[PDB]
Design a protein around this nucleic acid. Structure first.
Ligand code: MG
Ligand code: MG
Ligand code: MG
Ligand code: MG
Ligand code: MG
Ligand code: MG
Ligand code: MG
Ligand code: MG
Ligand code: MG
Ligand code: MG
Ligand code: MG
Ligand code: MG
Ligand code: MG
Ligand code: MG
Ligand code: MG
Ligand code: MG
Ligand code: MG
Ligand code: MG
Ligand code: MG
Ligand code: MG
Ligand code: MG
Ligand code: MG
Ligand code: MG
Ligand code: MG
Ligand code: MG
Ligand code: MG
Ligand code: MG
Ligand code: MG
Ligand code: MG
Ligand code: MG
Ligand code: MG
Ligand code: MG
Ligand code: MG
Ligand code: MG
Ligand code: MG
Ligand code: MG
Ligand code: MG
Ligand code: MG
Ligand code: MG
Ligand code: MG
Ligand code: MG
Ligand code: MG
Ligand code: MG
Ligand code: MG
Ligand code: MG
Ligand code: MG
Ligand code: MG
Ligand code: MG
Ligand code: MG
Ligand code: MG
Ligand code: MG
Ligand code: MG
Ligand code: MG
Ligand code: MG
Ligand code: MG
Ligand code: MG
Ligand code: MG
Ligand code: MG
Ligand code: MG
Ligand code: MG
Ligand code: MG
Ligand code: MG
Ligand code: MG
Ligand code: MG
Ligand code: MG
Ligand code: MG
Ligand code: MG
Ligand code: MG
Ligand code: MG
Ligand code: MG
Ligand code: MG
Ligand code: MG
Ligand code: MG
Ligand code: MG
Ligand code: MG
Ligand code: MG
Ligand code: MG
Ligand code: MG
Ligand code: MG
Ligand code: MG
Ligand code: MG
Ligand code: ZN
Lengths: 204, 127, 101, 97, 60, 149
RNA sequence: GCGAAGAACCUUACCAGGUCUUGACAUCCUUUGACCACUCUGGAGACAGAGCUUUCCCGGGACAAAGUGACAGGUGGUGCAUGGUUGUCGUCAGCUCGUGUCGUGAGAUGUUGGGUUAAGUCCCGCAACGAGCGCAACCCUUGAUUUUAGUUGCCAGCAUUUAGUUGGGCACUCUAAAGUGACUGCCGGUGCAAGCCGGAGGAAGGUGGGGAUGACGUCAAAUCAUCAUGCCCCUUAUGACCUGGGCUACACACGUGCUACAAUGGAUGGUACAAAGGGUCGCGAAGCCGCGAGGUGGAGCCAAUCCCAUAAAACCAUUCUCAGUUCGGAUUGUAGGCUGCAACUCGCCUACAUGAAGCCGGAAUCGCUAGUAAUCGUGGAUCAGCAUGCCACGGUGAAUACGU
């Protein structure tokens, strides 16, 4: 049986959209400009541990917020990387772009970051069990109420693919006021392609 | 000098107003036999005034919209029942005894995907 | 007094009823008892076995069909009826009363 | 004699914006008529759930637009200046006639 | 043949009725909604991510 | 095998003109495609014909006919030893009236006059005099039960 | 009636013929920096040949023509190497853990037994006492109602008009934010209890109606053709461009539907009552013309305002009078209407003519437990045009359930 995307089940219920702008007659072009912005930002700040990007619009003016774990790489020594990004985004959109940076405290409590971590260990040939268990350990000692991870694919370069999952605490997926974060990332292996799924049930 | 009631049935809603008079029923500025040319519908509409013995003491002027003719009649009946309930508290048992104060809750259901209706399903064949 | 809208009346009341019915007067058991009194070791084999595992001495009236070797201070008698059990229990209780003062 | 129409995808931020506009207009002006709730408009998008087969398994999505209307009757320079100088949240769309 | 298909769809056609629509993320010809310019699959995944404003899963 | 027990029963309403539930059940049994008004007017016209010809109220004529075409015994299938056989059984009151109305309408639709009001009126009048298609339908049902008793 | 929420050209991946080779699509290289657009000649078109021609900005950059690689390009294969997404049992009721006890041990108990429930839902027993993910609740909608708010909504008491029109007012419907309300809560019986049968009040009574929600697992189930990807193949061709055809073929068999076989009906005339939706390179009113499909005309609208927009069954009169017919509409002949460069293969619609089978369907088989089935219309996505399909909306509105 299939499950519904836990984030999709909570958009508008207890969660919020990542694109907080309203438009009519200029909706498709705004949407695809936002998609291009997101892709270009994701391809530039790859190794900066970026957790979330949100975009807003108001009268020929694009505001971008980048929730990231370590702002020192994003916000440079005095504004080198930020201004390079802003100029490139200006040339990409032909608008006026203002870039705002915030820092994620307790970065082990965010699902995308831990999924990136597990994918990075798996790409570096670290046993899947070790990576999953250690990520669970750190996430739980960071103050979570529940963690669940699974890794699926040609595990260890075998001929037949399978999936293995581990958990600690509780993750109630059917409760609507439960605030589960969720992330899926791919690891690029010489044997194929591996998938890492992470559910984090926080206090809310 | 005016007793008001609001009736509803299916998607029909009716503003019923009741004034002392002779028995003249008015529906949407149209006569109640010209608006309703059948007879059983008139019987069901005047059930609330027959349950109690106050049939000919009142005039009802109504303002209905939504739904169809039987829905029109049901909404009118509910509205006049509530107006009579407003006239005197002692009418409350009798109108409750015939179920004329209940607003009928059953409304048309929802079309479901994979089905041809609310419940009707496609024809099934093993082979 | 009220913390739930209606779940108190629905659940909590029967919860206390059943819990106190099972528990009795041991709501303030500070530690393990220094002795036990058993009406009969046949119908209460679980209790006497559990006490034996804890090496706690026991005292109990038994019938002609009970096991006396498990109780170290066995006192066979007629555990049926009411007067005999009440008399033996009252004797043991006012006996402990005259010494615990 | 001044019309304002506010439209958004959720009623919380739009409620805040409408109440704030009413507050500022009352402060710097003389009169205002309370926000009339215009009917919300919703559109439904039915999409096949699978990638290849399975017509009978689908998924509905929806999109709702919430609207409010405000009138200022006694227009004064302070009221107009304060209303035009407001900074409404992003995601709430304002139209002044 | 996919990049040639996308490039030909982007080019101005010889006749006005020659023109058709493709999904702007993946160059898919069928099932393209034209408020979003997205095929059904890209629409579904972007809606689950939360990157299409206003749209939410419909319960009603 | 599942069924969890007896179920509730429907609560029909007395007719606005002839204040009886059985008239309502007959009207419902004649209904087609949810057209209450057509069958209702047809029944009113048929009772007009009855009152015109016989000269008495149509309600007692209708009740006499229904009393004359309600069954008592009926044949039901029983599967024993790998073979199915017909056997006698007695109907409840509800099934009694149900079969009466079903046969009345079924054999009134099969008569040979121009309209439907005439067909219904003639079938009712025949049933009130122990004659007609609906009358013989319960005669053999009594016969079929006896031959397998 | 599955991908396909729109195959005349395009889509298009297939075929025939005509053409191209660092390339239709990307980065870097080397010279030039705005190239493209336009006119005419030839050609079915792709393409070639002449003129006007190309206006980068502040050495940077993205665009731009030429020549050359490094490279690009595959809807090519393997779903039995994969990621992701989905079906199915099935919204079926299960899947486990902590601390104790019983076993030499793997293990067991709780989770077995009797009742009850929609349910591992709950009760009573019982060497177990509890908890967690699944059930239930939190979310959406519908049925009653209070406060806040009265325009584009409503019109009662008032003047007005072809008209709720204009004045005037939020009284009433309505709209939409926040609350209230239902819990076997109270009564009688029954039971040790859970519970079961009836009763009161109430808009609503036994999780009130309906959604979203799919645990652990099964089928090497579906998809390399939405996407991505290991490995294996092609590289003057398995890549790329074009015009024409094909996916619409037809002795036949199966699946899902639409229209009927008539009097509860056909034709003609009159005449009521909805809901949910769509509209700015868009919806398109009045008036005039046409037998009709339509044409013309341009009002009001970025819309609770204007348009789509005639609801149809139902009801009332006249007629037909049981007839393969005043039923039924296939099939074919002629004349037209729109969209589009273009309607032959192969669009939809109209007028006149023609008027096939078909008399309620064999063995057999399907759906449905209430505003349901049955029936009547309406809107939307895809969309220049094209649906009897799909997804939603209301009007009228049943029969039956003894039982396993
Ligand atoms: Mg499933
Ligand atoms: Mg998902
Ligand atoms: Mg998931
Ligand atoms: Mg998988
Ligand atoms: Mg009126
Ligand atoms: Mg009116
Ligand atoms: Mg009136
Ligand atoms: Mg009038
Ligand atoms: Mg209504
Ligand atoms: Mg559904
Ligand atoms: Mg279907
Ligand atoms: Mg089918
Ligand atoms: Mg079959
Ligand atoms: Mg689709
Ligand atoms: Mg899909
Ligand atoms: Mg399926
Ligand atoms: Mg479902
Ligand atoms: Mg590709
Ligand atoms: Mg097209
Ligand atoms: Mg019943
Ligand atoms: Mg009726
Ligand atoms: Mg189907
Ligand atoms: Mg086809
Ligand atoms: Mg071609
Ligand atoms: Mg390649
Ligand atoms: Mg392989
Ligand atoms: Mg394959
Ligand atoms: Mg696979
Ligand atoms: Mg498979
Ligand atoms: Mg296969
Ligand atoms: Mg798979
Ligand atoms: Mg295989
Ligand atoms: Mg199973
Ligand atoms: Mg199982
Ligand atoms: Mg089990
Ligand atoms: Mg066992
Ligand atoms: Mg449970
Ligand atoms: Mg649930
Ligand atoms: Mg309402
Ligand atoms: Mg009751
Ligand atoms: Mg309902
Ligand atoms: Mg509910
Ligand atoms: Mg296979
Ligand atoms: Mg299978
Ligand atoms: Mg198979
Ligand atoms: Mg296959
Ligand atoms: Mg490939
Ligand atoms: Mg691919
Ligand atoms: Mg495929
Ligand atoms: Mg394939
Ligand atoms: Mg495709
Ligand atoms: Mg169908
Ligand atoms: Mg049909
Ligand atoms: Mg005809
Ligand atoms: Mg007519
Ligand atoms: Mg109407
Ligand atoms: Mg409307
Ligand atoms: Mg349209
Ligand atoms: Mg229309
Ligand atoms: Mg309409
Ligand atoms: Mg013939
Ligand atoms: Mg033809
Ligand atoms: Mg043609
Ligand atoms: Mg054609
Ligand atoms: Mg003709
Ligand atoms: Mg001929
Ligand atoms: Mg014949
Ligand atoms: Mg015939
Ligand atoms: Mg069946
Ligand atoms: Mg059922
Ligand atoms: Mg139908
Ligand atoms: Mg029809
Ligand atoms: Mg229709
Ligand atoms: Mg229909
Ligand atoms: Mg329609
Ligand atoms: Mg349509
Ligand atoms: Mg169309
Ligand atoms: Mg259709
Ligand atoms: Mg057609
Ligand atoms: Mg249909
Ligand atoms: Mg049953
Ligand atoms: Zn796509």
């Amino acid at each position: 049986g299939q499950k519904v995307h836990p984030i999709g089940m909570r958009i508008g219920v207890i969660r919020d959209w990542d694109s907080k702008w309203y438009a009519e007659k200029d909706y498709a072009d705004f949407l695809h400009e936002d998609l291009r912005i997101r892709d270009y930002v994701a391809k530039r700040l790859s190794d900066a541990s970026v957790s979330r990007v949100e975009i807003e619009r108001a009268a020929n003016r694009v505001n971008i917020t980048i929730h990231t774990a370590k702002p020192g790489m994003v916000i440079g020594k005095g504004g080198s990387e930020v201004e390079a990004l802003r100029k490139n985004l200006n040339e990409l959109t032909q608008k006026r772009v203002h870039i705002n940076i915030v820092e994620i405290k307790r970065a082990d409590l965010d699902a995308k970051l831990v999924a990136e971590n597990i994918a990075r260990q798996l790409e570096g040939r670290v046993s899947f069990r070790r990576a999953q268990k250690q990520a669970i350990q750190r996430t739980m000692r960071a103050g979570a109420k529940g963690i669940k991870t699974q890794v699926s694919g040609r595990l260890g370069g075998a001929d037949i693919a399978r999936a293995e999952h581990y958990s600690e605490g509780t993750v109630p997926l059917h409760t609507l006021r439960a605030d589960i974060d969720y992330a899926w990332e791919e690891a690029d292996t010489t044997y194929g392609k591996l998938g890492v799924k992470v559910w984090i049930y926080r206090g809310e | 000098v005016q007793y008001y009631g609001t009736g509803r049935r299916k998607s029909s809603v009716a503003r019923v107003r009741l004034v002392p008079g002779d028995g003249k029923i008015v529906i949407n500025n149209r006569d109640w036999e010209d608006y309703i040319p059948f007879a059983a519908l008139r019987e069901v509409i005047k059930q609330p005034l027959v349950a109690t013995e106050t049939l000919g003491n009142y005039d009802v002027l109504v303002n209905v919209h939504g739904g169809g003719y039987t829905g029109q009649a049901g909404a009118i009946r509910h509205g006049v029942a509530r107006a009579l309930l407003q006239v005197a508290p002692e009418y409350r048992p009798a109108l409750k005894s015939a179920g004329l104060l209940t607003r009928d809750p059953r409304m048309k259901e929802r079309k479901k995907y994979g089905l041809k209706g609310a419940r009707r399903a496609p024809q099934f064949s093993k082979r | 007094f009220e913390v739930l809208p209606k779940k108190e009346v629905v659940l909590l009341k029967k919860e206390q009823e059943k819990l106190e019915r099972f528990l009795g007067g041991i709501k303030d058991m500070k530690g393990l008892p220094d002795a036990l009194f058993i009406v009969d070791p046949r119908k209460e084999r679980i209790a006497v076995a559990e006490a034996r595992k804890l090496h706690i001495p026991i005292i109990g009236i038994v019938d002609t069909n009970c096991d006396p070797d498990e109780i170290d201070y066995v006192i066979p008698a007629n555990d049926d009826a009411i007067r005999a059990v009440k008399l033996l229990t009252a004797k043991m209780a006012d006996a402990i009363i005259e010494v615990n003062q | 004699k001044i019309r304002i129409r506010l439209k958004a995808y959720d009623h919380r931020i739009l409620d805040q914006s409408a109440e704030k506009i009413v507050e500022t207009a009352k402060r710097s002006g003389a009169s205002v008529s309370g926000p009339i709730p215009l009917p919300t408009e919703k559109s439904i998008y039915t999409v096949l759930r699978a990638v290849h087969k399975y017509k009978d398994s689908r998924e509905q999505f929806e999109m709702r637009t919430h609207k409010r209307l405000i009138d200022i009757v006694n227009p004064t320079p302070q009221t107009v200046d304060s209303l035009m100088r407001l900074d409404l949240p992003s995601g709430v769309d304002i139209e002044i006639k | 043949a996919k990049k040639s298909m996308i490039a030909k769809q982007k080019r101005t056609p010889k006749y006005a009725v020659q023109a058709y629509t493709r999904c702007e993320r993946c160059g898919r010809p069928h099932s393209v909604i034209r408020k979003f310019k997205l095929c059904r699959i890209c629409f579904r995944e972007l809606a689950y991510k939360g990157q299409i404003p206003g749209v939410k899963k419909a319960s009603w | 095998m599942p069924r969890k027990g007896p179920v509730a029963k429907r609560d029909v309403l007395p007719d606005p003109i002839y204040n009886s539930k059985l008239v309502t059940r007959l009207i419902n049994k004649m209904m087609v495609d949810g057209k209450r008004g057509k069958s209702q007017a047809i029944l009113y016209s048929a009772f007009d014909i009855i009152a015109q010809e016989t000269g008495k109220d149509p309600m007692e004529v209708f009740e006499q006919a229904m009393k004359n075409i309600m069954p008592l015994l009926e044949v039901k299938a029983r599967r024993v030893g790998g073979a199915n056989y017909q056997v006698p059984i007695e109907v409840r009151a509800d099934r009694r009236s149900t079969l009466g109305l079903r046969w009345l309408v079924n054999y009134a639709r099969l008569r040979g006059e121009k309209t439907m009001e005439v067909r219904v009126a003639r079938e009712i009048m025949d049933a009130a005099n122990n004659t007609g298609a609906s009358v013989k339908k319960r005669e053999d049902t009594h016969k079929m039960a006896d031959a397998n008793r």
